[PDB]
Ligand binder design. Structure first.
Ligand SMILES: Cc1cc(CCCCCOc2ccc(C3=NCCO3)cc2)on1
Ligand SMILES: Cc1cc(CCCCCOc2ccc(C3=NCCO3)cc2)on1
Lengths: 236, 40, 273, 255, 273, 59, 59, 57, 40, 40
């Protein structure tokens, strides 16, 4: 008989501990694995695939239309859309990125925001996208917007433009749930010159917008998502 | 040290440290180079 | 590892930021393709986002309850919660469920922890330590009928005996019939016109049954069982869109009617911040 | 002078040419291949009809109009009646296959509109009834007709609400599945190569569909002034590397 | 090591005891610079004054309380102490606080011990062993609303279950967002005119929540939770003047008005012994 | 199963003992350290800096 | 005295676990084995012997 | 280990499927003696049918 | 590691991995070859 | 022997045995020698 002493914590059950256990089914042989395409190893692998952002959130019931950012022909100087960058809330929240970020407490890294244009091929347009780093207000006019991170996008044969929100930060991690100290800025978009439709054409054209994370990205300290809850256990 | 005979009884696995998003982010048939035009 | 390299002014014919999303790719664009950057290192590995880590902590998967009371004159033990069972399944409680259904096929060993606590609702005396018996009853095994049937002999069926207030823990290898468990299944068990549709047909894993071994004391004792499940040795294939609407049933994808808009409406314009 | 843009796919006795492609997607970066022995279970030698089943079948055409919500086809169902592919299907106990899907929609440089073409492995549909109502067989086996998401709820059928993918997930996130867009201004076809994806090495072709192909208008069709307000969309699909096993009497399936 | 060397009479032009304190230095003068000394050795290392040792013993950081009682008809569990929480923080109890605030920035892993003892104020019978569940609820996680919410499933959130009367122990890595925790912060969360000032804005570490898993017995049971915290792997920068006045608030430096003189007045003259 | 005997003191909590514990946050990666001037290692380092004495205590 | 911690599952009895136990009969010597024809090692050995099927179940 | 070997058409004078059960033997006939098979491996050892396992719980 | 002195006290035995059905499936005195006629 | 995988779970650290008061006691720009005049 070897002398032992038990410490504080004996008998506790910590849902996060990782130890060995007896197998209830001694000697059982599991089914062989066969090959299946698509294996995922890290959630970091999947948040780099871009998905659509319901940017046009202004509706009243969920609709395919809140994915469409409208553009008006012949407007000059004006603003196309605006949003803050609380990736865990608001427009971002239902996107795959938003949806995964919510399983973690802290995030750090660059984001990739792209816009794909869908107007007739014989039209043309020049837009400016601007990222405003924390510390200033959402820009109120392009002059204000153009003094921060921006890209003049020229609509052409190449249909999409990929803007990166480079990680601009004092503190090396931000909270995924919106927090002030930790806030990330604003994203706005304005006409640089203006949309022009060809003859025989009319109305609004739309941009689709996507979001995905750069390879830069870090997420840490897992927790429970506000995105799902329940009141009684389900049954069959 | 495993104290038990069966493999199911061992602790959690250890980090894939595999990581290759290209099956998801770039499943295109003809390879796209960043910087070269998307559609030629 | 560098998180960003140093990059300076650019005036090229080589534009990495113009792409064609119609192709289905997400081109790997970085901060340094469109602003001037400085070197910085990652200092991070992505350890805690490994799927083994993501699915590897214990989650509550089931809460049931049984009572110790005089079975004298009870015509239906099962019905008096003289013992109860559970049609094993991992989709009944929905926190762990959303996590698993981020994948289509999943393969793992399970580690179960079972916590059992007692409650004495009707003002009482001395509680004699109750011992719970959890026994696994696989498909095609004599289901138990009374709380003290021959079934409980469990001569060939794994069973664990632990005390109420304590915890029991053991681990079961991946018992799936195929190479992975289907998180989803767009099929039937056969081509009948009225047979159920889903997975419920697929995850026929049999049920788990609990009872108190103790005979009855003078008062009644409520024992409530909580089953926790931890995946170990995880393997997951084919990522899918996360669950947006609420769940209604074990094993079907169905969402409730007149549900509410899941996308938050802006308080303001598209232009609003 | 090769462009990403022009392409030719020859499979069996049938060829497709597109002069306005946008590359092609190969699901999960894997190309269809036959079933290796190391992965095999059934001891039966399999049958590989080759060129008589691995050719291109063009399903009947759809009509995109400003009110369209989107269409959904299931595989191998959509092909249950095409030539010898279909016969083989009803006659063997088990079968396995990959596909090349080519979705076509041409317009002019004055039109606008953008379709999402996506392949979803194991697309289990939801009942519009809620609760645990099931979706009857016939409803998930529309055949070449596919399911029309702008048709009315029917009884025993699935829900046809587009912002929810017919299953409780948001349209916006379908992009995690192999997919390609058809943006009239860019593109005129979409091509996806689908490797066989299952948790078993070979399965039944009638009780289980392993992918749904979905074509969904996202930016509404907008025709030039006084143009007819609609465009046809055509889907052509070719089984590839098909194998059938366990031949016998010929399945009888509901309806 | 010598504590003092031998030194004899001196009649020099080299005076080590005259200095200019205006410079900000404390010149390293020793007994042997001004008296005649003999050799002596230190016999000591200064082991127990290492900062790891100084901050490394468990200190009580929080006492809370929850009760097990029939929740039937309770409209606000939180309010009935049917479960309770704690807005994690280390500055609420002030013994450990003065010790930490001897430094400006501090970095360490934490080891928590949680002792839970039960009390039965209203004359009672048999107490059935209660099991406490402590679960960590980080910022932006579904806060729990009833004592038996879906929240308690805690499928992704670390939780520990232990018995009242026992102790639970586990250790959490340094969870700070920056490189160190700020013991002080002369800033705001943004440049608003009315936003709070201090650290409270900085140490947004979320809260910890406790509950009893047991249903209710006939009597009521008070369970009082004591959280102990031990720093391990300590790193401390920039020493500061020790706290002289009493504390009034978590996270602000504020002292009470009409406080009392903190320097003891002489009973006698400056000349007094 | 290896035979053991538990000694007096089992289960006690001594605020001054130093042992290992399970981490509640398995696999979490702490923020990198950056350099900060002023690190203190021993309280013996700081009690050698001189400070003023309120000698005139008579108020 | 070596410090220990007990985990969840301590004290449980799992009918399927396989561990060592003290022998109640220390030092006892079992009867020698003699040879007996017919040893079975696997149930897989015996299910390969064919047996009759009551196919005509209609009684 | 192979569970089934590959075997093709047969037109022989050597018939493994005709036997005389009166002898008391169970002749070791396999799928490949009477249909055309493909190779497949066992992937299994028969561990949990060992008598030690069967009587050991 | 055995902690106990007697052999009865050790854990379960380990798989025969013996397996030879012929004493049961082919106890015939003159050897029968599959493919050759049963009765000559 | 660490029984646990993560570094936070290890016991207390071990004595700096670093000790250098000069950053606090003599942060002067031009070095002062004891015995030499303070102000020259
Ligand atoms: C998908 C999916 C995955 C799972 C889990 C399957 C687990 C296999 C069967 O689970 C058990 C549970 C309990 C016991 C048991 N044996 C003795 C006591 O409990 C054995 C196997 O369920 N659905
Ligand atoms: C300064 C300063 C330093 C600290 C301490 C921070 C500790 C990090 C968060 O603390 C916990 C507490 C409890 C748990 C827990 N998990 C399961 C049970 O308790 C996890 C982290 O607070 N202020």
């Amino acid at each position: 008989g070897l002398p032992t002493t038990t410490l504080p914590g004996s008998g506790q059950f910590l849902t996060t501990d990782d130890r060995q256990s007896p197998s209830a089914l001694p000697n059982y042989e599991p089914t062989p694995r066969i090959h299946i395409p698509g294996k995922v190893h890290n959630l970091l692998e999947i948040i780099q695939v871009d998905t659509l952002i319901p940017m046009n959130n202004t509706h009243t019931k969920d609709e395919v239309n809140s994915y469409l950012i409208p553009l008006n022909a012949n407007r000059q100087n004006e603003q196309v859309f605006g949003t803050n960058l609380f990736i865990g809330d608001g427009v971002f929240k239902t996107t795959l990125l938003g949806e995964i970020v919510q399983y973690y407490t802290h995030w750090s890294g660059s984001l990739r925001f792209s816009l794909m244009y869908t107007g007739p091929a014989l039209s043309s347009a020049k837009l400016i996208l601007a990222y405003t780093p924390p510390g200033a207000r959402g820009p109120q006019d392009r002059r204000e917007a153009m003094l921060g991170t921006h890209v003049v996008w020229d609509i052409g044969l190449q249909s999409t433009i990929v803007m990166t929100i480079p990680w601009t930060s004092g503190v090396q991690f931000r909270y995924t749930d919106p927090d002030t100290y930790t806030s990330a800025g604003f994203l706005s978009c304005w006409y640089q010159t203006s949309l022009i439709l060809p003859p025989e054409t009319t109305g609004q054209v739309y941009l689709l917008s996507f979001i995905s994370a750069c390879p830069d990205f870090k997420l840490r300290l897992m927790k429970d998502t506000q995105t799902i809850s329940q009141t009684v256990a389900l049954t069959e | 040290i495993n104290y038990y005979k069966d493999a199911a009884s061992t602790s959690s696995a250890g980090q894939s440290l595999s990581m290759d998003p290209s099956k998801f982010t770039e499943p295109v048939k003809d390879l796209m180079l960043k910087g070269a035009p998307a559609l030629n | 590892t560098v998180a960003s390299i140093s990059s300076g002014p650019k005036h090229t014919q080589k534009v990495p930021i113009l792409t064609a999303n119609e192709t289905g790719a997400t081109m790997p664009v970085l901060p340094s393709d469109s602003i001037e950057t400085r070197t910085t290192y990652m200092h991070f590995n992505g350890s805690e986002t490994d799927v083994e880590c993501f699915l590897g902590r214990a989650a509550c998967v089931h809460v049931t309850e049984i009572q110790n009371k005089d079975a004298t004159g009870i015509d239906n033990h099962r019905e008096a919660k003289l013992f109860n069972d559970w049609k094993i399944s991992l989709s009944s409680l929905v926190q762990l469920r959303k996590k698993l259904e981020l994948f289509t096929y999943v393969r793992f060993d399970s580690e179960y922890t079972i916590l059992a606590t007692a409650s004495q609702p009707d003002s009482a005396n001395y509680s004699s330590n109750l011992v719970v018996q959890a026994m696994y009853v696989p498909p095609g095994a004599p289901n138990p009928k009374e709380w003290d049937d021959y079934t409980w002999q469990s001569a060939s069926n794994p069973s664990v005996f632990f005390k109420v207030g304590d915890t029991s823990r053991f681990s079961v290898p991946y018992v799936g019939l195929a190479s992975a468990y289907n998180c989803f299944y767009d099929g039937y068990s056969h081509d009948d016109a009225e047979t159920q549709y889903g997975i419920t047909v697929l995850n026929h894993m049999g049920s788990m049954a609990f009872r108190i071994v103790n005979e009855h004391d003078e008062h009644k004792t409520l024992v409530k069982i909580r089953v926790y499940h931890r995946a170990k040795h995880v393997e997951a294939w084919i990522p899918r869109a996360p669950r947006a609407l609420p769940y209604t049933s074990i094993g079907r994808t169905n969402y409730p009617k007149n549900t509410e808009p899941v996308i938050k409406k802006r308080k303001g314009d598209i232009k609003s911040y | 002078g090769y462009s990403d843009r022009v392409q030719q796919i020859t499979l069996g006795n049938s060829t497709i040419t597109t002069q306005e492609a946008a590359n092609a997607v190969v699901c999960y970066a894997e190309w269809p291949e036959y079933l290796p022995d190391v992965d095999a279970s059934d001891v039966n030698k399999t049958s590989k009809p080759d060129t008589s089943v691995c050719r291109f079948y063009t399903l009947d055409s759809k009509t995109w109009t400003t009110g369209s919500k989107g269409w959904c086809w299931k595989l191998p169902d959509a092909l249950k009646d095409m030539g010898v592919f279909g016969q083989n299907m009803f006659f063997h106990s088990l079968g396995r296959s990959g596909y090349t899907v080519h979705v076509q929609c041409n317009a002019t440089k004055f039109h606008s509109g953008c379709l999402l073409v996506v392949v979803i492995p194991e697309h289990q549909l939801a009942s519009h009834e809620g609760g645990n109502v099931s979706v009857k067989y016939t409803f998930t086996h529309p055949g070449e007709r596919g399911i029309d998401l702008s048709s009315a709820n029917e009884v025993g059928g699935p829900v046809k609400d587009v912002l929810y993918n017919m299953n409780g997930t948001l349209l916006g996130n379908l992009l995690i599945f192999p997919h390609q867009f058809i943006n009239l201004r860019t593109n005129n076809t979409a091509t996806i190569v689908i490797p066989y994806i299952n948790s078993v090495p070979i399965d039944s072709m009638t009780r289980h569909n392993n992918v749904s192909l979905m074509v969904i208008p996202i930016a509404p069709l907008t025709v030039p002034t006084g143009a007819t307000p609609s465009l046809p969309i055509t889907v052509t699909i070719a089984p590839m590397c098909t194998e059938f096993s366990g031949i016998r009497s010929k399945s009888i399936v509901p309806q």
